[PDB]
Amino acid sequence: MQHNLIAFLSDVGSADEAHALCKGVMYGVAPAATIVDITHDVAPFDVREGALFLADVPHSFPAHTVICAYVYPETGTATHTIAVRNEKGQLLVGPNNGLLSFALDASPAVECHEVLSPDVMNQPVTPTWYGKDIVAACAAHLAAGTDLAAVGPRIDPKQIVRLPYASASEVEGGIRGEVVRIDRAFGNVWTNIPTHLIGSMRLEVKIEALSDTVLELPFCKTFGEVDEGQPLLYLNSRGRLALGLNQSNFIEKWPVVPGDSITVSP
Amino acid sequence: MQHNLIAFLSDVGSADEAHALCKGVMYGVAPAATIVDITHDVAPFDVREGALFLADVPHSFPAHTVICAYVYPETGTATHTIAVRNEKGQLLVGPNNGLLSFALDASPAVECHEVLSPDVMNQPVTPTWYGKDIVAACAAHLAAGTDLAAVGPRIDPKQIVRLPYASASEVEGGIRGEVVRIDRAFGNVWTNIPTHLIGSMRLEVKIEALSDTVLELPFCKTFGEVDEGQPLLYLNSRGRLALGLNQSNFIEKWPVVPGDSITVSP
Amino acid sequence: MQHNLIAFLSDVGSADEAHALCKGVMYGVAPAATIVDITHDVAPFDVREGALFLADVPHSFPAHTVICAYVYPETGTATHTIAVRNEKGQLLVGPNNGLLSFALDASPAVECHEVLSPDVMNQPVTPTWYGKDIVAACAAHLAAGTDLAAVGPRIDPKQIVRLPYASASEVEGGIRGEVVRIDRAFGNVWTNIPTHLIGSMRLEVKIEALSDTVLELPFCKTFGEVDEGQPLLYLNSRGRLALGLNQSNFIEKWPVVPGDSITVSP
Ligand SMILES: Nc1ncnc2c1ncn2[C@@H]1O[C@H](CCl)[C@@H](O)[C@H]1O
Ligand SMILES: Nc1ncnc2c1ncn2[C@@H]1O[C@H](CCl)[C@@H](O)[C@H]1O
């Protein structure tokens, strides 16, 4: 099945030609394809950050999409590239190192194969750039309509490496969660606390590390509901609880990092 | 009318997936469309900077263009999104907060509507991301050929919020103007002084704040007319007067900011 | 001959609209064209860096590609823009200041013309932006199928300015070379030492400036062959010798710059 829309993510940056050579390879194999960047500014080697960036990609993108993604410090070793068809019908290609975990939570694997066949690769294969020669090349082949079965042998979806993600839970108070990611352009803090856990309960937010700092925060539908510069709690596009300042940068005011505990209570 | 070329600007950056999810929504509604980024690195919340970046966009881009732009700290409140047809025939979609002001100076609004109809939106609409769910979604619908009248009710062009812009004027000497923007890649300074005001009159340039600094500058057609490192005055692509150093960075040598007065005389 | 794929490089950055106005001009002249960025974050005025970024572009990109590239501090002077057909069949447009040197090493010029004819330019031509009004505009015309002979007069390939590049040589030991570029996203160091010179000979690497620092390094096929954080020598995608740390940044650990000598011996 043709998938004329390739969505492309990596940790190689857009500041040099590296990412564009990959596209060069892709347009060569799939001249009908539209290539769109997700981002290339995933922090180096950071599989987790890459995986978070891919989470909402299945839902935002149409079914004829190939998600092409690589953050691959394991390039040129035993850790293989995989190719996947999800429940939506989209195709996904990347290293089997956890990168596709959160994309697959959004729309599970129906079929998966290890990418092993040289006919879907860019020959010769450079040991230090599987991203281009295997991931990108295979992604374009699948876009052009190559059968998923031709890429290599079938594997069970549990052979796909998954990244552990902490779930928010009820304590007495009391909801305990953590900082998942930071919306870097604005400095809004994203937690793992979903809509339904807070639905129960101005609220009290404790950020213990550091430094046992408590804030009394209003819950708003949007930023403009508090005065300029003032803090707020809101639910984001993903149904997760978030912290921000109206027209300012929250983490510059409260240097929280991913992993940090967030407790919210009446 | 089909407008297969969507030109896309925001303040969300390109360092994460946010801007690409918007494109995901757009390719879904308009699979025939070509999406090209203007830039996503408008400083956060900075409507003015966004508006300057859009100025030359009507003229540089063909008539079948939809200009899709959002810098929207007012997302999820009473400040609506608007959709506009200009005199060139282009379509423009963005928040009614001043963002489209300078694009509209270049090619005025012929027709404008508030974007209110749910059928041109991405349901459900997230209060904190009108950019994606209203601005991007509506832009794609108009690209695909949706009638502008279906987006919501007509409004008068004066109901479109405009940003004030200072005009350069003749004093005795003597031309008084100000710093509009900085060409950040190179550090060239852009003023609001047009070709015709200086046509009259090496020249003398005073930058009063700060610190009453006077420079004797040659007027050149281009950078290579003075020695490497030396300062010059020239007219830019926009017919505005500019200050630069040949193969160096002017603002790193003279820390001027937008708003600062520039006086030029014989 | 139609060349529907335009690959675009400059030093104007992607942080503002400048690069996108160029694309605006290109889609206008060539509505069938696909425009893909190589990168716009070439350091300002740095022709050499631009030229290195273009090296692998002929080989990575299909034959129907127009390579459109400008780093042009000589804009609006006697240094002309050139247009070139290479041995692969690709077309290249840029300033005659050395920028196309390394792209042309990969696939030599078969035909070259100075770009002089106003009918392949964007009128009126702004002296300070040949990038947009000549380079971009001509690139789109050639993409759309304009004959290369219509752009201006033919010239001999030796009238194309070439940048000098240092070759690695055998000494006694002993191979002497230098730092060519830094893989900035990761901090891997690229040398000019090819596969065949080291084929002869853990190895000893001396980086004399600075500060006569010697390292005993293993030669590996890829990063994961040494422990996390440890240094390695490997051959890259280009058949050049490279230095890196496994999942870390080499130049942050050893502040080498392009030009620096690298000596490798048993
Ligand atoms: N010095 C280094 N150590 C470990 N991994 C590295 C590396 N340089 C690049 N990569 C990794 O090579 C991949 C291309 Cl296949 C990129 O995604 C990047 O993660
Ligand atoms: N903490 C914050 N305060 C005010 N506005 C914010 C914000 N975070 C994002 N936006 C705004 O949300 C818009 C998407 Cl609709 C973006 O353009 C951005 O301007």
Ligand SMILES: Nc1ncnc2c1ncn2[C@@H]1O[C@H](CCl)[C@@H](O)[C@H]1O
């Ligand atoms: N202050 C300055 N001095 C010398 N060259 C400059 C400059 N500002 C922009 N350019 C040069 O103008 C070109 C567009 Cl034609 C860009 O590629 C850039 O290299």
Ligand code: MET
């Ligand atoms: C260091 S990863 C693979 C090397 C490739 N040449 C690149 O530019 O990233």
Ligand code: MET
């Ligand atoms: C903070 S603005 C709207 C939120 C959206 N999730 C984003 O990535 O920007």
Ligand code: MET
């Ligand atoms: C300074 S180079 C040519 C000027 C052009 N206006 C630009 O944005 O770069």
